[PDB]
Amino acid sequence: AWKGEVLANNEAGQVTSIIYNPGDVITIVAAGWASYGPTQKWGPQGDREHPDQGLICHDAFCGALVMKIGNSGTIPVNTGLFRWVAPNNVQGAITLIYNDVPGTYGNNSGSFSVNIGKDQS
Amino acid sequence: AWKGEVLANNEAGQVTSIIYNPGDVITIVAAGWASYGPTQKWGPQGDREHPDQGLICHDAFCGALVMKIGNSGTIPVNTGLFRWVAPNNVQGAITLIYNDVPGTYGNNSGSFSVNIGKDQS
Amino acid sequence: AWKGEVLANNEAGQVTSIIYNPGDVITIVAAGWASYGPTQKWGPQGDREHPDQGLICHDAFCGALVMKIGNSGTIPVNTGLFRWVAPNNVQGAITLIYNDVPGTYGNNSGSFSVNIGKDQS
Amino acid sequence: AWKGEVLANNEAGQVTSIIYNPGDVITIVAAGWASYGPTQKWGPQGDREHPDQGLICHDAFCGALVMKIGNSGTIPVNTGLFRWVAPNNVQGAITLIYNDVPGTYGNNSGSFSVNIGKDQS
Ligand SMILES: OC[C@H]1O[C@@H](O)[C@H](O)[C@@H](O)[C@H]1O
Ligand SMILES: OC[C@H]1O[C@H](O)[C@H](O)[C@@H](O)[C@H]1O
Ligand SMILES: OC[C@H]1O[C@H](O)[C@H](O)[C@@H](O)[C@H]1O
Numbered sequence: 361a362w363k364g365e366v367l368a369n370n371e372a373g374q375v376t377s378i379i380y381n382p383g384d385v386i387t388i389v390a391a392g393w394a395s396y397g398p399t400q401k402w403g404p405q406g407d408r409e410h411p412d413q414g415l416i417c418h419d420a421f422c423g424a425l426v427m428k429i430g431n432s433g434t435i436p437v438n439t440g441l442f443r444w445v446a447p448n449n450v451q452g453a454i455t456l457i458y459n460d461v462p463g464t465y466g467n468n469s470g471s472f473s474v475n476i477g478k479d480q481s
Numbered sequence: 482a483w484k485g486e487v488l489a490n491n492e493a494g495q496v497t498s499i500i501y502n503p504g505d506v507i508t509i510v511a512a513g514w515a516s517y518g519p520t521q522k523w524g525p526q527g528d529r530e531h532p533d534q535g536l537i538c539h540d541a542f543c544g545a546l547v548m549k550i551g552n553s554g555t556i557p558v559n560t561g562l563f564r565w566v567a568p569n570n571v572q573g574a575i576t577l578i579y580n581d582v583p584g585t586y587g588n589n590s591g592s593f594s595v596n597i598g599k600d601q602s
Numbered sequence: 603a604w605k606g607e608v609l610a611n612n613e614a615g616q617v618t619s620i621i622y623n624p625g626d627v628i629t630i631v632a633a634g635w636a637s638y639g640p641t642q643k644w645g646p647q648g649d650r651e652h653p654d655q656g657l658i659c660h661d662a663f664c665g666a667l668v669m670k671i672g673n674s675g676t677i678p679v680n681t682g683l684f685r686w687v688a689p690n691n692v693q694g695a696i697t698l699i700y701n702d703v704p705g706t707y708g709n710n711s712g713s714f715s716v717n718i719g720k721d722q723s
Numbered sequence: 724a725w726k727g728e729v730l731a732n733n734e735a736g737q738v739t740s741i742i743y744n745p746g747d748v749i750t751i752v753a754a755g756w757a758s759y760g761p762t763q764k765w766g767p768q769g770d771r772e773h774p775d776q777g778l779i780c781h782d783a784f785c786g787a788l789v790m791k792i793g794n795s796g797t798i799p800v801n802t803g804l805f806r807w808v809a810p811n812n813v814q815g816a817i818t819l820i821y822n823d824v825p826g827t828y829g830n831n832s833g834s835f836s837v838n839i840g841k842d843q844s
């Protein structure tokens with residue numbers, strides 16, 4: 361299991377120690393407050409009022425938490441995933457990423473605290 | 482495990498099938514958009530800008546998800562809890578509740594989708 | 603979780619810190635070598651060749667590991683239990699006992715090492 | 724989880740469905756009665772009084788339950804493993820095997836019943 365923080369200004373993403381293997385069941389819980397630029401902050405579901413201006417994940421709001429598994433496409437995480445299984449061909453290290461437009465992470469602030477574990481089978 | 486939806490207008494909150502006993506380790510993941518009155522909506526951490534005007538839980542923002550376990554006081558859930566152990570002597574059925582001021586739930590809207598499971602211990 | 607030793611000459615049994623609650627799923631693994639009297643020793647399944655001369659558990663061999671949950675009757679453990687659930691109305695502290703005839707524990711020797719955990723639900 | 728029986732007379736051993744990946748935590752519980760030749764039978768810890776005359780696993784008794792994980796050497800299982808983690812660089816499918824001297828399985832009898840599960844990690 362992994363516990364850390366995903367900084368909103370970290371464009372490359374936070375690599376975790378979790379390697380998602382075929383058949384794994386995982387749970388993720390995310391919490392905290394961050395911004396993609398404004399004074400206002402949002403939690404891991406991001407800002408439902410802000411338009412998509414070229415986000416790394418089009419299936420979540422700006423300011424949301426998303427992930428890749430290996431070099432997969434971005435997968436929405438938001439507040440977390442409960443006993444979740446990836447698509448069959450998806451595997452590799454889990455990288456956690458704040459959802460913003462490429463090149464615009466430098467003005468971000470805050471972070472999410474994220475915990476990941478593998479469930480029993 | 483238990484999966485269900487907690488309505489923001491339900492002042493009594495929603496009882497779940499989960500009985501918490503001493504020693505138990507639990508994980509909760511909560512998702513969704515709800516409001517305590519305004520046309521805006523907030524996730525399970527609620528509205529960090531809004532003052533406490535007599536909330537059922539003073540340790541969480543207005544519009545946050547909270548819970549009671551048996552005869553306990555309110556405990557913040559927010560986005561969830563990862564492999565969490567309850568305070569000393571806490572025991573009984575988990576009830577989930579939207580954090581608002583008593584008597585003011587009538588103008589609330591939306592819901593949270595919540596999963597609760599017991600972990601290994 | 604709990605780990606410890608169960609002495610073959612302990613007629614009262616070894617109380618554990620595990621309280622079995624309704625709906626709990628438990629796993630037990632036991633190891634070691636013990637005797638009810640003879641110079642030979644046996645594992646946690648006991649001695650399949652020896653007759654029952656008034657054992658505390660008639661559903662296990664002499665020299666087997668058994669348990670009580672609360673003030674239940676004796677339940678065979680043997681080498682252990684995998685993701686096991688108790689019958690209705692069985693609850694309380696787990697006590698681990700060597701299966702021998704009452705009043706005859708004085709000539710017993712050896713012990714079993716036992717691990718107990720609660721599983722995910 | 725996987726469940727099955729490991730025949731004492733099966734020199735190839737029993738290939739399970741469990742794939743051990745780095746970081747995985749496993750639990751095994753084994754039960755039953757088997758022999759390496761004599762008319763008497765022993766549990767999964769084997770015969771503590773028999774010498775090692777060239778066993779496939781020199782770290783367990785003759786008649787004990789052992790395993791290999793992918794390409795690895797033999798590892799003792801005995802009555803089971805509780806929340807066990809393998810070394811660095813040990814991975815793959817788990818094969819269960821009765822511990823006897825190669826070429827001498829033909830006179831063996833009985834079997835062990837084995838449950839294997841992956842724990843939370
Ligand atoms: O059947 C149980 C009895 O077995 C005898 O062999 C032993 O010496 C007694 O102490 C008692 O344990
Ligand atoms: O739409 C995303 C965009 O939003 C605002 O304009 C921010 O100031 C930028 O940094 C970028 O995050
Ligand atoms: O502070 C809580 C309070 O917030 C606003 O006033 C809402 O309109 C009320 O219904 C109540 O929820």
Ligand SMILES: OC[C@H]1O[C@H](O)[C@H](O)[C@@H](O)[C@H]1O
Pocket residue numbers: 759760761773774775776785823824827828830
């Ligand atoms: O030591 C192992 C050896 O034990 C006895 O000799 C059995 O008869 C053999 O088949 C072999 O299993």
Ligand SMILES: [Ca+2]
Pocket residue numbers: 396397460464465466467468
């Ligand atoms: Ca930005």
Ligand SMILES: [Ca+2]
Pocket residue numbers: 517518581585586587588589
């Ligand atoms: Ca309200």
Ligand SMILES: [Ca+2]
Pocket residue numbers: 638639702703706707708709710
């Ligand atoms: Ca005795």
Ligand SMILES: [Ca+2]
Pocket residue numbers: 759760823827828829830831
């Ligand atoms: Ca043999």
